[PDB]
Amino acid sequence: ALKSMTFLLMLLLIFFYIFAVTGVYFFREYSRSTIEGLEYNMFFSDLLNSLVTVFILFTLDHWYAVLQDIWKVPESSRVFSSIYVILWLLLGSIIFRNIIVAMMVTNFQNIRSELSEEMSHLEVQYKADMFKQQIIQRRQ
């Protein structure tokens, strides 16, 4: 199956790449904010930290708490940034989860299809062997 996983991981890492490098300078007012009381500032600070936090968003753990901690940013009518991160997390999570479960289900499907054709071939070979045994018995 991981042999069959030839292009899905490449698309996964490239969607990760584009969305993470896009979302570095989107909540740029969060880590680079002078609010004394904050605890998730290091999430969006560095590029590798951006990779870590968008992988966290991909795993979808405490996205509500994360968004409430980014709600401490001055609310600029949430017109582009919140919808961008929400669409990124939902689209990436559901699309890639569905695509990988679909690929592994298709792997099981073709494994069983090859098995089915193989005992089908074995059965027709056995029937032909029985017919040729009857032919040999008659020819004697």
Counting contacts by CB under 8 A, is residue 65 touching other proteins?
Answer: yes
CB environment 71-92: b (16+ within 10 A), e (fewer) = eebeeeeeeebbeebeebbeeb
Choosing from 9, 18, 128, 130, the residue that interacts with other proteins (CB under 8 A) is 18
Collect contacts of 68-76 with beta carbons under 8 A, ≥24 apart: 69/38, 69/39, 69/40, 70/27, 70/30, 70/40, 72/30, 72/33, 72/35, 72/37, 72/38, 73/27, 73/29, 73/30, 73/33, 74/29
* Shortest reach from residue 23's CB to other proteins, in Å: 8
17 binds other proteins (CB under 8 A): yes
Question: What radius of gyration do the chain's Cα atoms show?
Answer: 28
Tell me the closest approach of the beta carbon of residue 136 to other proteins, in angstroms.
29
**52 vs 103, which CB is nearer to other proteins?**
103
From candidates 11, 35, 115, 130, binder to other proteins by CB under 8 A: 11
Q: Is 124 in the site for other proteins (CB under 8 A)?
A: no
Tell me if residue 7 falls in helix, strand or coil: coil
13 binds other proteins (CB under 8 A): no
Residues within the interface to other proteins (CB under 8 A)? 6-8, 10-11, 14, 17-19, 21-22, 24-26, 28, 47, 60-65, 67-68, 78, 80-82, 86, 90, 94, 97-99, 101-103, 105-106, 109-110
